[PDB]
Design a protein around this nucleic acid. Structure first.
Ligand code: MG
Ligand code: MG
Ligand code: MG
Ligand code: MG
Lengths: 128, 129
DNA sequence: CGCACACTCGTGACTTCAGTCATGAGT
DNA sequence: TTGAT
DNA sequence: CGCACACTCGTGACTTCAGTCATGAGT
DNA sequence: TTGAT
């Protein structure tokens, strides 16, 4: 049986692998800065109705595995996740301005991949 | 494999399914054939790639590939709302069983698709080296 | 190298009112 | 301030 | 009879200007 | 006008 969420006019299962990097690929996401970023990203995610299945912060990039509804558009939540986290991180960690004084904490691009929650076998069963 | 746009790199696939209103097995013969041409056309207009398409008498199944900017409610609306309008015009006999102004069930089912499961993907994430 | 996602300049949209998203072009 | 997830 | 995704009515947005999307409530 | 992909 397929894992499926139900909403008003749709049944769905939507997961994405989202990834982005620190501007200039600076390795600044370490220690308390990485810990903070985890809080900030979870708060933004919940504020936006996103479920964070997995989160991993490496020094120069972030990897998220998200579960969403059909109404949450990609450019919208990526903007929330990155734009708001940049704003907060700079406030909470003024020391970031030492390596990133240009007004950006993040690389201006994101990489995103859809993800199958269920197996190909489960899908053919449901689809047949 | 991975596509690119001005500010993003992505690979987006979705299984999209919806049924005929009241579950009537109406999509058959020339009606089904015309549905396919109408869907392919709508997909073309909206720049949506249709990887797989299947039309059963009571429901449709598509495997789509899209850009990050193509939101789900928008493309589902385009494919279902436009095809319905067009199907009734092209095949009026549909009205014999569906005179209420709806060719489609008001719901859609949609699943993100990838070349691996999240279980595997998350483990790959928890590693680092 | 010469791009390009990633660097830079530019545009508008819109939250975080800063710094992303959208976006074209030059290197 | 870049050099790849 | 009650549900709901699937039936219906209700509320709007927006193309297909009809019939879907958004959506809350009854059955 | 419904009963499940
Ligand atoms: Mg960007
Ligand atoms: Mg609907
Ligand atoms: Mg270019
Ligand atoms: Mg209900």
């Amino acid at each position: 049986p397929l894992e499926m969420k139900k909403g008003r006019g749709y049944v769905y299962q939507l997961e994405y692998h989202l990834i982005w990097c620190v501007k200039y690929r600076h390795q600044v996401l370490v220690g308390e800065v990485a810990d903070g970023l985890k809080d900030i990203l979870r708060d933004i995610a919940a504020q936006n109705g996103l479920e964070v299945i997995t989160m991993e912060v490496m020094p120069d990039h972030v990897h998220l595995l998200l579960s969403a509804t059909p109404q949450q558009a990609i450019p919208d939540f990526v903007k929330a996740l990155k734009g708001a986290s940049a704003r907060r991180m700079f406030v909470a960690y003024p020391q970031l301005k030492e390596k990133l004084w240009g007004g950006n904490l993040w690389n201006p691009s994101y990489c995103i991949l859809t993800v199958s929650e269920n197996t190909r076998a489960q899908i053919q069963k449901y689809i047949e």
